[PDB]
Amino acid sequence: VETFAFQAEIAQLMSLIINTFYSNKEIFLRELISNSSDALDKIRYESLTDPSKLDSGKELHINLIPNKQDRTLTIVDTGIGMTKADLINNLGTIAKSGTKAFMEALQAGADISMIGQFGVGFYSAYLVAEKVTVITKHNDDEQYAWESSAGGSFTVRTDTGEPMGRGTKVILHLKEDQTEYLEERRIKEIVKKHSQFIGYPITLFVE
Ligand SMILES: CCC(=O)Nc1onc(-c2cc(Cl)c(O)cc2O)c1-c1ccc(OC)cc1
Numbered sequence: 001v002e003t004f005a006f007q008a009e010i011a012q013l014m015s016l017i018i019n020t021f022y023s024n025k026e027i028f029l030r031e032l033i034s035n036s037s038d039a040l041d042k043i044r045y046e047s048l049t050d051p052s053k054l055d056s057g058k059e060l061h062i063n064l065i066p067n068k069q070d071r072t073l074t075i076v077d078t079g080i081g082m083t084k085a086d087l088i089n090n091l092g093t094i095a096k097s098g099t100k101a102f103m104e105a106l107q108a109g110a111d112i113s114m115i116g117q118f119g120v121g122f123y124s125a126y127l128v129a130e131k132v133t134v135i136t137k138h139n140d141d142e143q144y145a146w147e148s149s150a151g152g153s154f155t156v157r158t159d160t161g162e163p164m165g166r167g168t169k170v171i172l173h174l175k176e177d178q179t180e181y182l183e184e185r186r187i188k189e190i191v192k193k194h195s196q197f198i199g200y201p202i203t204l205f206v207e
Contacts, residue, residue, distance in 0.1 A: 001157045006148075009099045010090060010123070014150045016103075017126045020112065025178065027113045028128050029064075029187070030194035031121030032075050032170055033202065036062045039079025039168060040200050046080070056139055056166035062198070064191075065205045066182040071174050073128075073181050077200075078167040081138035087146045087156055091134065094119050126150060128181055131173040137164045 006014065040060045047053045057078050065074040086092040098119035105114065115121050125132045134146040143164060148154035172181075180186045187204055195202065 001155050003153055003155050004088060005153055007090070007096060009096050011152050013095070013099045013102070013120060013123055014126055017112070017123055018150060022112045022127070024111075024113055025127040026181075026190045027115075027194065028124040028172075029075075029181070029190050031116050031124045033062060033191070033195045033198060034116060035122060036075060036077035036079055036168065037198050037200060039077055039081070041079075043078075043080040043166070053139060056137075060200050062200050062202045063205060064187060064202065066184070066187065066207060068179070068182050068207060071176075071179065071182070073172045073174060073187075075170045075172075076167065077169075078165070081141075081164075081166050081168055082134075082136040082144075083138045083141040084144050084156065085141075086138070087134065087136065087144055090120075091122050091146070093122065125170065125172055128174055128178040129172040130175050133171040133173070135159050135161060135164065135169040135171070137166050137168075139166060 040062070043053060044060060060078055063076040065076065066072075067074070082092050102110075102115060102118035102120060105118065106112075112124070115124050131147065131149040135143065136146070137143040143159040144156055145159040145161070146154060146156050174181060184204065184206060191202055191204070
């Protein structure tokens with residue numbers, strides 16, 4: 001297991017997301033589904049000229065898996081996946097510059113829900129999760145697990161879990177007071193509100 005420090009800017013972003021009073025937490029799901037959609041677009045586009053890139057799985061979809069026993073909401077996609085380097089490099093984001101812009105925007109009247117316009121929507125996971133685990137597999141690399149409970153550091157390790165084939169799994173270990181996001185009615189409502197036109201099937205698993 002390798003432990004890394006977040007860059008100062010990202011640690012600051014995470015602290016802001018965790019400590020700022022902001023009731024409209026449900027946008028985290030929109031942001032994560034948007035990331036999955038982007039990753040699905042990328043593998044789709046690459047497959048247009050090289051169909052072998054789908055040898056690791058032809059289906060392009062998003063699954064939402066609540067588990068009330070474990071208090072986890074998991075978002076699974078079969079998009080392009082991230083390399084180890086991507087994970088370490090802020091989950092494939094322009095986190096330093098994006099955070100800078102987001103901060104200035106918040107002073108220019110913006111609110112936290114606009115975080116995706118600054119390329120760092122992933123971190124909205126911390127609106128509802130005390131810990132986030134990201135398991136990912138890119139065609140050109142091995143399967144890795146990234147994890148962080150904030151507090152300035154994250155870990156990366158080779159994943160020993162179920163082989164994914166290709167794509168990304170985000171496991172949200174929910175805060176005790178955020179269990180509404182495990183309720184079928186609530187998830188359906190949020191997907192319909194914010195993700196109605198996403199171009200991949202979104203399947204909400206039941207328990
Ligand atoms: C497609 C992008 C890319 O090159 N590679 C990716 O491969 N997998 C993911 C991914 C990342 C997260 Cl955090 C997720 O929740 C779900 C995902 O499938 C991304 C990705 C998506 C949006 C980004 O910035 C907006 C940066 C990276």
